């Protein structure tokens, strides 16, 4: 129900940084990021169009740490919701509580944010929520519980987030360890490297 | 109003009874072509007024025999 294996294999297969490490070091100094894993990694056998769609889907899944059944349900919800299906899917993924905890800088990675959520360190609107997939809505306040404010993990994670592009759809107070989900991100707020139409097409087959 | 049906007499060989073919024009549920469909009713004809070929107006009543639950109203146009 969670991927527990080596992390940089996933990035190396996707051929890009999935941000599955804290980012204290460059991912180059920890692995051969330009080479796919395994004995025949250096090879680069032509990828079919199906392969391209599959790899895009897997890359987004692995960024956010979502298994296939949950991800498929996300696609179904995005298709049901009014508007652009791929943008809806990205918005749903960004709304996850573990992802929001990471985006506010409380967790060094999304897996650390997930553990913070799971281990009951996170409050949404003053109430403990330990569900990683909980959907945060606009104007919600996400805070570190008082018992967890002394954790060195969280201070280090806030330091790390200081050295990333700050999301504009959130408002974090690193002193009180509180953040506000102002609005759902638009597509411009998310990376232009994600090609979500490929995921939509994959699931529409 | 009174609910009525209009049709062609196709048999009058029963005492005080006739058989009336009612015609309906219905759209075919699959092909959409409007087709003609027939309903045959045993109708009570007191006075034995109707002949084969007349066009009669009928109305529904209580059962009068095993197969009769309609009675003559009038002959709209005779044969």
């Amino acid at each position: 129900a969670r991927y527990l294996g080596p992390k940089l294999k996933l990035s190396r297969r996707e051929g890009t940084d999935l941000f599955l490490k804290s980012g204290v070091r460059a991912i180059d100094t920890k692995c051969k990021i330009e080479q796919a894993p395994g004995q025949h990694g250096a090879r680069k056998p032509r990828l079919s169009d199906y392969g391209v769609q599959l790899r895009e889907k897997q890359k987004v899944r692995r960024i956010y740490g979502v298994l296939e059944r949950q991800f498929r349900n996300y696609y179904k919800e995005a298709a049901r919701l009014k508007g652009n299906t791929g943008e809806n899917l990205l918005a749903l993924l960004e709304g996850r509580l573990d992802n929001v905890v990471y985006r506010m800088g409380f967790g060094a990675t999304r897996a650390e944010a997930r553990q913070l959520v799971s281990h009951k360190a996170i409050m949404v609107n003053g109430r403990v929520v330990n569900i990683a997939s909980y959907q945060v809505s606009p104007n919600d306040v996400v805070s570190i519980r008082e018992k967890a404010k002394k954790q060195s993990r969280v201070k280090a994670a806030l330091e790390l987030a200081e050295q990333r592009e700050k999301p504009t759809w959130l408002e974090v107070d690193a002193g009180k360890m509180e953040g506000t989900f102002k609005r759902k991100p638009e597509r411009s707020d998310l990376s232009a490297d994600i090609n979500e139409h490929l995921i939509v097409e994959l699931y529409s087959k | 109003k009174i609910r009525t049906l209009q049709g062609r007499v196709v048999s009058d060989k029963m005492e005080k009874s006739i058989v009336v073919a009612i015609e309906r024009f219905v759209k075919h549920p699959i092909y959409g072509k409007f087709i003609k469909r027939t309903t045959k009713l045993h109708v009570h004809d007191e006075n034995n007024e109707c002949g084969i070929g007349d066009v009669v107006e009928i109305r529904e009543c209580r059962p009068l025999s095993k197969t009769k639950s309609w009675t003559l109203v009038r002959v709209v146009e005779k044969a």
Binding site: - | Y31, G32, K33, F34
Partner: protein, 129 residues
């Protein structure tokens, strides 16, 4: 034998356009005149006229834009072997609204947009695009 004069008129238009005829002529009828009136006011034909007392003949002036016939497609929909009626909610759009459907309503023969605006359905005569 001749059993659909409207399909005949549509076919005469289609074939005359394919042959680059400047005009086509057919025996007239009031229904054909109503359809031709819709065609003219929608810009698909230049003009029409009826001549003759006892055997009226309807002449349609065809139009061409840039070496191409203006009537790109013209298609019978309701026909004697299968009549097609639509309520106002289900009036067809032709070429996503860039064409027309010619509809016989109880207020007369008009385009599908005009029938929609008048809140009527009717018989779908033809599609013109």
């Amino acid at each position: 034998s001749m059993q659909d004069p409207i399909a005949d008129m549509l076919t005469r238009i289609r074939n005359g356009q394919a042959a680059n005829k400047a005009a086509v002529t057919m025996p007239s009828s009031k229904l054909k005149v109503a359809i031709a009136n819709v065609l003219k006011e929608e810009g698909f034909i230049e003009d029409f006229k009826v001549e003759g007392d006892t055997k009226p003949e309807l002449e349609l002036t065809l139009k061409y834009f840039q070496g191409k016939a203006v009537v790109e497609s013209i298609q019978r929909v309701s026909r004697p072997g299968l009549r097609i009626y639509k309520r106002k909610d289900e009036l067809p759009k032709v070429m996503a609204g860039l064409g027309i459907a010619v509809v016989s309503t109880s207020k007369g023969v008009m385009t599908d947009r005009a029938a929609r605006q008048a809140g009527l359905g009717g018989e779908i005569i033809c599609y013109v695009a």
